[PDB]
Amino acid sequence: MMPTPVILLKEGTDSSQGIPQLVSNISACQVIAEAVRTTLGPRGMDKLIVDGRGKATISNDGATILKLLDVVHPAAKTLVDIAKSQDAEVGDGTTSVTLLAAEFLKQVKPYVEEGLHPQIIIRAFRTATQLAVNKIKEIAVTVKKADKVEQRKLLEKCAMTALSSKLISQQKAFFAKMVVDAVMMLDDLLQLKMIGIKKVQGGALEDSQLVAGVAFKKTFSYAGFEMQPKKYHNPKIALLNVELELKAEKDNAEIRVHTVEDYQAIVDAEWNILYDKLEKIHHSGAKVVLSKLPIGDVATQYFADRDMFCAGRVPEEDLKRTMMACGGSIQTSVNALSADVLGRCQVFEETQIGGERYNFFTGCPKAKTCTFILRGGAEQFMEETERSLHDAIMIVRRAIKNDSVVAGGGAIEMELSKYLRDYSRTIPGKQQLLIGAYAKALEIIPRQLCDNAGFDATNILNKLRARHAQGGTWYGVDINNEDIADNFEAFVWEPAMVRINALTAASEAACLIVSVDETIKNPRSTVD
Amino acid sequence: GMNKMVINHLEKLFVTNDAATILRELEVQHPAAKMIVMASHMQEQEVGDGTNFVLVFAGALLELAEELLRIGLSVSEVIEGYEIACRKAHEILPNLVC
Amino acid sequence: ASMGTLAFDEYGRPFLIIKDQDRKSRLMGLEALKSHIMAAKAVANTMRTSLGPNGLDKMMVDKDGDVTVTNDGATILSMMDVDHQIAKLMVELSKSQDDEIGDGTTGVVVLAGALLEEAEQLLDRGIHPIRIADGYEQAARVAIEHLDKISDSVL
Amino acid sequence: RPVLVLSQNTKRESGRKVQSGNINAAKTIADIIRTCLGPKSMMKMLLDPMGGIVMTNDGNAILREIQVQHPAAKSMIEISRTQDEEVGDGTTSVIILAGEMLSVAEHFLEQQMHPTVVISAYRKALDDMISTLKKISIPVDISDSDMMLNIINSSITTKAISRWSSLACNIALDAVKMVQFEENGRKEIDIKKYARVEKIPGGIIEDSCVLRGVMINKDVTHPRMRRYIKNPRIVLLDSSLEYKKGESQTDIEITREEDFTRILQMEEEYIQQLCEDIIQLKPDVVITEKGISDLAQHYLMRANITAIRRVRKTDNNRIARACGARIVSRPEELREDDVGTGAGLLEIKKIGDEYFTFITDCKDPKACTILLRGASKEILSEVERNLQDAMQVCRNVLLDPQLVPGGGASEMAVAHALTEKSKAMTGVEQWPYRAVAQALEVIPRTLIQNCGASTIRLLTSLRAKHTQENCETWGVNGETGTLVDMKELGIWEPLAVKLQTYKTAVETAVLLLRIDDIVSGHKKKG
Amino acid sequence: MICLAAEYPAVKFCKVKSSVISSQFTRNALPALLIYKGGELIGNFVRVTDQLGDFFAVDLEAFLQEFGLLPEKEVLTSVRNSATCHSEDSDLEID
Amino acid sequence: PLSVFGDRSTGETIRSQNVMAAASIANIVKSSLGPVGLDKMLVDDIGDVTITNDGATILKLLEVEHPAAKVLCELADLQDKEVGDGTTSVVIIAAELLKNADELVKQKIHPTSVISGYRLACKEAVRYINENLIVNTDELGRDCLINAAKTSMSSKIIGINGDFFANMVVDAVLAIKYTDIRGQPRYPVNSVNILKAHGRSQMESMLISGYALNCVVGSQGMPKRIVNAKIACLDFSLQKTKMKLGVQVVITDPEKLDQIRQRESDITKERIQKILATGANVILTTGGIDDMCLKYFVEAGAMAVRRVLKRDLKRIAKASGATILSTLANLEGEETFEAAMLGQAEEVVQERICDDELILIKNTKARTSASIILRGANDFMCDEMERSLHDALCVVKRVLESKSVVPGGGAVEAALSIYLENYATSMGSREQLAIAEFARSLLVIPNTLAVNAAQDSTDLVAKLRAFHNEAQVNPERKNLKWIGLDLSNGKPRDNKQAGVFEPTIVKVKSLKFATEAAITILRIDDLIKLHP
Ligand SMILES: Nc1ncnc2c1ncn2[C@@H]1O[C@H](COP(=O)(O)OP(=O)(O)O)[C@@H](O)[C@H]1O
Ligand SMILES: Nc1ncnc2c1ncn2[C@@H]1O[C@H](COP(=O)(O)OP(=O)(O)O)[C@@H](O)[C@H]1O
Ligand SMILES: Nc1ncnc2c1ncn2[C@@H]1O[C@H](COP(=O)(O)OP(=O)(O)O)[C@@H](O)[C@H]1O
Ligand SMILES: [Mg+2]
Ligand SMILES: [Mg+2]
Ligand SMILES: [Mg+2]
Ligand SMILES: [Mg+2]
Ligand SMILES: [Mg+2]
């Protein structure tokens, strides 16, 4: 190095190039993977992360844990990004992607240290991943008769398998049945905004319920609200986007009068406008009035005098769910309130749930939405319950799209590893080592399962390898008996697309990391 | 060619093997290198590919010009020789179309 | 074990993974469970003296000097200035019991502290914490059924 | 919690960057003194850290006065010092050659050639270089004074002393010839110890001469002593001529009245006995490396003897060599053979405002002093450096009587021979061989650049001429910038100097090519 | 000091700025020749410019030697001789 | 709860940290292995520069903080002390062993099983080396020593210079040969004085048929060349006699002071006369000589050298047959010196070496000694030449002491890896894995050798393993055990045919030391770092 009186790049630029930087990138990926290892499997554990503000997040979800981590390593951010991608596309397997990518990099690291050209490793990864995806699609079990009973059983089993790693795994059957029931009621797009998630503190997990309709928290009742009846047996619901208050007609409106008679006429005209809106609402036959905009005390007392229910400032999502459940239409004007634009539910009731008042719309026969009311002893408890239910909902939706399942517990990966090793033993030998390394790296998930459960990983892996070699496809890790068992017969079912996406994303991340040979870091601007 | 992870002044990753992208994400301070970078960017704007070719050819030409200056040639003679050779290459190139 | 892993690479080059990783801390494995059990035990032992007819009140002082004398466990834990995350979890548990029922907000903390205290000596003997949680859930189901059995109705 | 493997201050650098940095540092070190080569070189002013000024064009002095941080630059400085110590000439040439070879090595290192191949090619090339240099050499009759003077002149035409060429050549030749010695079958020259250079600012440079003897900056101890003795008999001593304490603790115990006076009288009597022992040899001059007592001065003047005290040991050895005396420590053991007869005149004269002692008419003296008169201290220092170069070249010629054509003719001849030899290699290492062969052209190229002529045309013409059959002596005229024959111009240099330059340059390139990793900042751990 | 270090290799001449190590010491008290021997101050010389000037190596050498602080002064080897020092298994014959 | 004032690391964290430290130390010197290796240039932050390839020197010069890395550094130092060669190989092997053992441990294999497997693998590797991979030097002759020296001096600054330096080293080693009791030829290296001096090229390095002293005569009046030297070795200073602490001179009669002062020097004068009366020509003393005795020796036309090093004086006395005399005192209570105490040499000359002078004692009688004068371009190159020459001398000493050599170029490593991979299947179930990982770890040396040459390491090592597997399986093709790596062309080559040899003790000691270092580091699962 020489002073170079006129330096080329800006002062403070950091550059790392060659094999050492690739090894450092691999080590960083290993470090990132190590942070989420113990969260995988029914014997997994949760991680607690505290931000600068002092708030704590407790999660078993790999994507959430990685996001809460403030990763700044350029190569390590790839694992976080592929975890986010797996979460977005599938919703489950956010830990498997990171473990698989890190294990790929770990397996190919010794060849990197030996001076092997990265392009060869990338080609081997691409070939192995294509073969593995083809094998997954080939051996995935599907039934082409599609009856309601067996479809329900498959959905419930997939939901239980996706749920048997979280803190609600004790009530996994209950939660999975409830999640499948909620999902089956969505119409054609399976929109997540049509499934409500209400978290109410206090109460056990078994106290959580699914509403065959819509339910939302009471919204800032005005004076005179407590005189309105709080139960109806065949109400008609008027969904409005209207401000029912005494207010200026328009922001730029101005009234100019020069006689006291006109003054009184103007005051009475404002009152008559409000009362005309209220009378138009009342004459429609509706008994429950919900508005997106504030409802004043005058309107509240007017509706109370008519034995009618009012609720203003209802959020957008709650009104949308109410429209999709009862079957009305949101009206910005009350001039044409026909029976077509009026909702209908069998029973409306306001009850108390753990110190909160909730309005319930039940008995809807043709509802296309649902609302989850989750009970728990803590804020993060309910948050992680919601995350687990979201994972289960995503899995159930994907199963609805295509019921192609593979046995979990590492059985699918053992089959893939055996197939890949058999393929690799029949090629010249430069690609054979790398494909064998890929197959060996595919063993990470069952080994991690055994390690988390406290087993002896080596013996279980040996038994699994021997069983797969001698015949058997769905033999995986049996956590309860500390042994191996037929996971397909044990109903440890996974959608095939979960493993397909996991392998694809892990391979792409590994190829991207290997392809980089030089990293350059520009000096910071506006450090402050 | 191998991808390069380039981080600019705003913590933005740029992993790519595009020469123009790498140069524009690099804080180049030397003004002669600035001329060569502007030439590469002009090549990118006019055509769309060949920025790495432009940079490599310019670097090789400048090293060989340094060698020629060291052995005794003057700057003007080297410049005239490069101009004549560039004209000859432009004349030759159409005959190489396959 | 603490603060994470600091290697600075095996080639001498800088090894930065997480922003401000030198200023962050990390507890890994069984010692985290021991610390959490210890914190919960401390909170429960503080609460246990205010249980029953002969319980004694705690005399809370807020940041402004205002004085509150109370026996309500939920109120005491709400006004308690804690920093440990498990202590905050205990406070949230008391608030949950207050919201759902309104009574017994002190018994929940004592019961949780006793459960974690027993789980400590269960962990010391080489039992996976998930197994302890599953056994606790089974015993809780048994206790709930027994309560339903021995319950009595009033007019 | 700064857990680390190595120390915090340890810095490690490796790869292509280290090689590029080392080669660039060597190149820039060469570029520092590139312009100080040839008869048309320019002076450089060096500001010494201790406030002095060093004005010179010698490569070794300029490089020594420079402080550097890059270890490759330190290696180049050590190379220059080694070249100066071994032969005394060719420092600039060896630095430039090392830089050029490292440049042509970097050219290959940019490709995928391992440095070991380049080093092996360099070693083979160096062997062929030595062979060709020995081949194109010519013998010299050392008894021919004109040839020796011409060799010294060719050595000193590139220095500031070239304005006075005959005088400097005669001074150097006389000093080297009369410092030559042979005892017990062993031959020596010993320019370092004897043949002292004494510079007195003032006067004119044409007054500089080498004396047939020694000259010191000393005066008589007592003014009554003679300052001009015709044929002195000189006696040299180390022991003081004064009463000194014994080695052991020797406390006296006086209890009588006359013991104190007796002790003082015996001190005087011991001084008298030493003086009588010295006088017994009947000398004329007594020289001592230590003090001479006043009573000793009186007793010596009683015998008409000039005494000089506090002379440096090197000066006393030079006097002993010049006047044929033997240094004696005990006057009671003074033999006749120890008396120095052979000095033909001793004279104390004042130069400027300071007395100087001259013993300058010795017959067959084996040591001498070179009295330099000049304009100032810096000019005299440069003149002394040039005289040192001339004496080193004369000694090299006397020890090794082969000569090699100068003016870049040898460089071009060796380059052509190696290029012709490389045609039959038919291997992968032929390219570095030819490159390091052609790197020898940097010497004629630098000569032409300093002269101011056109480099490319002159190098092309010289190469074309050297492609002929008898043209190994065709080089570059340093003044007119024209192609001439060094058997006509007369510029010839010792084979030893060229051999040392070539070996040192090639081995410096080999040493610097071997490094590919740098770690620094660690404690000395002494 | 640089010149003195050549003839006195035993001494350990070192330099350090005042900033890295008071205000009154920085304004007009920078030149200090701190002499440390045995871990304690033997020479505490300050304001040395008054008795030195603004002086060559001879002046500083004399000033330090007049107080008996400079160690007593004591050939040029080729480069080096030693390579190690241990039980080097000197020559034997045995008959 | 511990309340220990310090930091504690437990479990996988400390194991990974130790492996990181060992791997970093290995990577420091991994680039200076084999002939295609390149040197490193160290700076001591005070301007001192050291260019070297020796692993021990590099690891000693560096300052290391982590203790697991200090273990490897002192392991390299121990390997240098007990063998003299293979200093980088042992460090690399130990680091690779630690890395693979840590991988096994992270795979939930108990460290005790890994250590037992490592011990078994080391024992069986040593046995296999001794029983299958040794070549006797009796049927090879001087060519074996020359080839061993050349192989040792590869990867050093005297590589291509090997054709000359190997002859020089072999002659120097054979010159100092002696046989002790039991008739065992013992070669006492470090008795070859290595003198360095910049100047002429490396080809001009001179091997002295005698001894070389880095000192000159004390007085310019003495002759600088004595033909028939009679060396007198002394261990006392020749100065003016001074009484000891227990003797004090007190004068009451003033007439005795002159006699006292005269005797103070007459004692030394009489000693000098007694020494010179036996015909002594060269006088060597460890102490100093004042000007008076220097003049005494000048008048006699004899050598006199002061401040001679003790080891140099002992070597000179042993070679020339002289006897060290710390004092002049016989068993009769007198003070005498006899001619039987005088050593003899065929010539003593003060020669000039690059503006400096040194004393050459040529052709000592009754015993032959040797010294080497290394000529280089600067101080750093001379130092590196000295280090490489010491390595070559140690290698030649090992080869001449134990007459077994092993093929070079990683052939031994590949053969051991194949044999141990085959052998692991016959022992245990988890120590099986430990032995397999030991075999895999032994492959790091050829991999590094191939990588340093910018060759395809994977293909070359695969071909080497195939050759050795064929040699081990087929019992009619056992000549392939000598197939190693030819880094010049990047092809497998019969190294025994090519003349690439190493002493067997190098491999054995390196394996044993690396195994112990790996076992020592692997035993740690917790670290407590007390705050100072
Ligand atoms: N009952 C079970 N038995 C064995 N393995 C299971 C069981 N349930 C889930 N798994 C395994 O857990 C892994 C996924 O763990 P989990 O944390 O639920 O999701 P993620 O993949 O997002 O980490 C799957 O590979 C699956 O094989
Ligand atoms: N009269 C001359 N004409 C042409 N070249 C000369 C003449 N005298 C000397 N030279 C060249 O100049 C070089 C000597 O340059 P010099 O300044 O002495 O460098 P250095 O001090 O390193 O020897 C020699 O190579 C010689 O060939
Ligand atoms: N000519 C050669 N050809 C192939 N391999 C060699 C040759 N010379 C040495 N080697 C190998 O290079 C390796 C490195 O040795 P080296 O690093 O010089 O020893 P040390 O480890 O003591 O520094 C040795 O194990 C040796 O087997
Ligand atoms: Mg999951
Ligand atoms: Mg392109
Ligand atoms: Mg109560
Ligand atoms: Mg010259
Ligand atoms: Mg070696």
Side-chain angles (χ1 to χ4, degrees), chain A residues 361-410:
Chain A
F361 295 84
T362 59
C364 312
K366 51 167 63 45
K368 297 301 176 65
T369 191
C370 276
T371 300
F372 278 87
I373 295 180
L374 304 177
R375 325 293 314 280
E379 191 269 332
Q380 275 311 306
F381 185 92
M382 294 182 286
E383 283 289 336
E384 187 56 24
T385 312
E386 167 187 359
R387 291 182 205 117
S388 304
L389 287 196
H390 178 258
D391 279 0
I393 282 157
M394 294 299 291
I395 290 298
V396 167
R397 290 172 60 211
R398 294 319 194 258
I400 294 295
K401 299 289 94 176
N402 44 309
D403 55 354
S404 199
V405 288
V406 295

Side-chain angles (χ1 to χ4, degrees), chain A residues 16 24 70 72 375 377 379, chain C residues 9 13 17 19 92 96 100:
Chain A
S16 185
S24 304
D70 204 353
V72 290
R375 325 293 314 280
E379 191 269 332
Chain C
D9 212 15
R13 297 177 182 178
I17 316 300
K19 159 180 305 213
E92 294 195 34
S96 299
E100 177 60 33

Side-chain angles (χ1 to χ4, degrees), chain D residues 423-437:
Chain D
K423 283 173 171 165
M425 293 177 71
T426 79
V428 69
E429 67 178 18
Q430 56 171 324
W431 308 102
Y433 184 95
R434 223 167 305 128
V436 71

Side-chain angles (χ1 to χ4, degrees), chain A residues 79-91 94 501 505 508:
Chain A
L79 293 206
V80 178
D81 214 340
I82 68 160
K84 285 157 142 159
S85 160
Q86 170 92 8
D87 188 11
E89 176 78 16
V90 166
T94 54
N501 189 179
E508 279 193 346

Side-chain angles (χ1 to χ4, degrees), chain D residues 1 5 7 82 86 114 123 184 238 244 248 253 330 335 500 503 507 514 516 519 522 524, chain F residues 7 36 39 43-44 48 63 65 156-157 199-200 202 204 225 243 251 261 295-296 299 377:
Chain D
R1 315 267 64 76
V5 168
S7 66
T82 286
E86 177 64 39
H114 200 265
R123 290 192 157 138
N184 279 20
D238 303 352
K244 299 289 94 176
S248 312
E253 292 203 339
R330 299 188 77 165
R335 287 192 296 107
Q500 192 55 46
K503 292 166 183 167
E507 280 185 343
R514 202 79 202 287
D516 74 329
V519 290
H522 55 260
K524 168 75 141 179
Chain F
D7 315 317
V36 295
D39 300 349
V43 180
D44 283 296
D48 272 23
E63 41 173 357
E65 294 293 328
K156 306 293 196 269
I157 205 59
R200 298 167 164 79
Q202 307 183 187
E204 268 86 359
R225 197 216 184 216
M243 313 292 255
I251 297 296
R261 294 160 61 86
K295 298 312 179 298
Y296 291 166
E299 303 288 338

Side-chain angles (χ1 to χ4, degrees), chain C residues 44-81:
Chain C
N45 286 284
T46 296
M47 295 298 102
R48 84 181 270 149
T49 47
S50 298
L51 190 78
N54 303 122
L56 305 167
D57 303 275
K58 318 266 173 283
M59 184 176 177
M60 294 309 255
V61 184
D62 59 355
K63 66 205 295 185
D64 294 320
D66 309 322
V67 175
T68 299
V69 186
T70 180
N71 197 273
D72 197 73
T75 312
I76 292 157
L77 284 193
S78 283
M79 293 177 70
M80 178 174 308
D81 205 327

